[PDB]
């Protein structure tokens, strides 16, 4: 009994989304390492790497599970979505044989073919899901999903021999043969499904924007009963000032904002580019590795211009911010690999509208007193210290922040690195939900059929029979949700902005022709859809 | 600086309102003076030392900027760490509402 | 046990809205008739009228029951709202005495006062609710609701004696003393509530817009299997044409649109005005009475201009259309009665966006053949007949239409006139729900306290002691609703347009100052909010 699965079901409790897509297994070569030496002149760093004949299914995004309309209803009626479960089923396996002839390529069923699939419930192989690498089902059903090959990075002893750093691999090099593990041989007419359930421990990710500025919550009517020290006068007077309720910037507050990198966003107009936005490394010029979204901050802020409420607001993209690259939708001969070093035009930028818990901000202590009169001219040296602008405002004990919202393309989960102690790891900087035990990587490969054996004559094994498998991939995921409790207010509350396409056409639809009649162009919004829809009092 | 002092309220005080003092200048507030029985003495320098140059980024980093200056403000919270929050003043507020927010850190101590 | 009632509760099944407002009972004079003679020169028509000391509570609007935010959530999450019940409770009755003195007016409690309230469950008095007359609770809580006086029109024998028509009242004149009926004397500390339940027979009024044009539903791919007669050729050839699927205008259809008046909307630019838009009357110039919204049509259509998608669309207001007059919100000394004949500027126009089941349309049979060649030059006379443009396209047996949507100010119910046979009366042209047995009119009056009796000396009764009652008015109404079943589609569906204020400020909010500091100006949208939110396939 194979049934095509599809459609979503919303309930008050739970959201159940189901897709099915024809998938393909290319024949992947045998285990091959990919060793790319690093260079200190560039930013390259040595990777030992491995490539595997196996291929896995990466279903991890919201965009995969929620149809755009299903993502819309998600926000309208709900708040606090948390993922509950994930099923994946391979079914309708059919394995073609590609026979290359001078006549031509003739594909024909192989009644004898098979595929071999298994999942890691033991997490015993390098867990490659959740790093936001583009292997996903195309947004369009009817766009075949060709399963990504599986590979994994491993490190050796990494030495700086010269301008170029190389890994000699005399340690810590691992070779995982997935061949050696219990897997389930499948063949035409076999159904393999793997059900999985996220921890109950996952946090509820709010779908709604905080109402109030963090630092302005109080009664504008009364004066405070506290007196902040403004500064000293008349040599030791230490004048005190009692802030009125209205004074929002000046009122002492119980709870500080979360951390901030206070990075420049389009404040540098200079044509020069940062090699890397934020990188914790210990080479003056020798090397580095980025920590890009090092904090939970808007990657890009709307920041409405003021020229008569300019129609196109200036969108500020913070260095270290991240934008989802728009995939090519059934796009033929536009691959345009000739653009190198991965320059990407017009990515989805995840622009927040500055409904943030706290306005975008950059200076830890910004003030203009003049000298601190401790370390005032300089400390013990020529070094002029305790400079007022301090980058990276740090996390203090009393503190409050919200992580990034859920973009429609946001990754759903990721694997909290297996490590002794971790801190707020449940909120990944880059995505939805850190999980200790994630959805297993489901490894699939064509059962290899070798060619005719030689009578021990030339000792070169004939290449495997060229063949490929195509199958339905059922993947259903259940989300726990809570219907929104509307703030009880007398105002109609302006909805989150409906998506906008550069084209001006409706988003997530097939446009007839963009300078072609041939194929329709599926249109995605100019910017990343953000799951934050309605205010809620903080 | 950044400290806070409770303003003394006027006790049945008639025609001393003295609103003519503006911008909320307050004289003689209750200052919550600790006696320095603190878990750790009052302290200001993260790394205070006088070696001379660090001999990493010693004269300057990649620029004219003279970096890694010994006095670092805001000594940060590290993984092993211990502190006590402020005591309870007789005027201390009893409670407050932890802002409704996704993740908070030691919010139980305002 | 008196408790202030308020707040709304949404459920999957039912919406329960509750308000409470301080109310007042003025002292209304004794029964007084108001006899206004009519004139044929003008449009005036004689009314005998009556005014009653009684006062009633008209709670009938959606705006009364649904807080703007509660009306917003209504649309977002729901479809098909039908009213279930209506409770009304008078409570916290307190009756002041106004003592007018040369010292001044001194109000003081009267421990002895009372009010007298009863409801018509027998509908035995003229039912005055549901004609859309402005007696309603102000949108702002804190705006006291002073109960409207009760009166009723009655007709006599209406004769044209002269240019001016007068009613001699020798028949059909009725005098209703509500004094003579069972009512419940109330006094300080008494609670009177009247619960009421609408029929189950009420139709579900959809909150969602029809998806498809009525006349284009079919497969664009195939040609039709029918041949429409296009016209005759070669003297009796009668050429037939098989419409392709794409041809939407030309394809013969099973179901015709509903009726239409095909009225001109801003097509006349002439400064001359219609005395009355649509009036079925039988006086050449002698008299008429309007049937204004004579059909279910958009009262006003958006009709987007084309000048580069002009930012301000030209809104077309069909003659006979109706617009809700914006009430003055706690507006002091702006009464401006000096504007007479009820000229109203900037009413809420109930503008539909032309998501209609069928586009706005005006000609029954519009064509340009030349002569019909039946009655071609003229019929039996000089009269040139069967003119192609026929006004008032009529309701035919196969037909389909939707009534007007539910404006946020739409009246909730009305009383289907008690009459032998009625047709689609359940859909009132002007409002929400026609009901056979409506919510009873709840008549209230101050218990009259006469002044000191004279020793039969001047035979002029002292005026009643001047007094007035103030009380809480609890009115709760329950609506049956159905959560929206989203059309299963891959597109995010653009929401109904969020309200817009002329001011540009957020709608339904208190604006600090409009050229005053004194009182805040409550702001209502430029146009009537329409309850149609999301498409649904028809």
UniProtKB/TrEMBL annotation, chains A, C:
Principal subcellular localization: virion
All copies of domain Coat protein VP1/VP2 Parvovirus, residue ranges: 1-494
GO MF term (any one): structural molecule activity
Region feature Disordered, mapped onto this chain: 484-519
Keywords: Capsid protein, T=1 icosahedral capsid protein, Virion
GO CC, one annotated term: T=1 icosahedral viral capsid
Keyword hit for Chloroplast: no
Source organism, top-level taxon: Viruses
Intracellular or extracellular location(s): Virion
Sequence similarity: Belongs to the parvoviridae capsid protein family.
Name of this chain's protein: ORF2
First and last residues shown, out of full length: 377 to 914 of 914
